Amino acid sequence: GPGFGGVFVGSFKIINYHLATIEERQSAIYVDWQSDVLVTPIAAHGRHQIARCKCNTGVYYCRHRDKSYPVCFEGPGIQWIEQNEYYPARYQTNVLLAAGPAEAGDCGGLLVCPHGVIGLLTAGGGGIVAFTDIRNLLWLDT
């Protein structure tokens, strides 16, 4: 809803690995440390949908500025080995690169296109923001 709490699809919840808790990690149904994402069952009716598109443009929420920024990002590739306050020097998978304001506190924001959510905000800074594509997880049905 607000846009800073992960994705809630059906009875499942999607969040970043660096922002997850131990209980969620233990009960998670899918995890990708390289992509920095978890998928764990959640007892709720999700009102979100995953984008089954190839959109190259979208809008993301900047929590530390509390504003919506549109941006045209690059496709899902593997990115530079950088080290954060959470992580060691490593390269991430399914990374969408775009230009825009970002901060350490905004980790977890939502990127949306008309079809739905595309990815979560992994990290950003210095005018460059990187997201984790989640389009490969659109199990809306079973």
Ligand SMILES: [Zn+2]
């Ligand atoms: Zn789209």
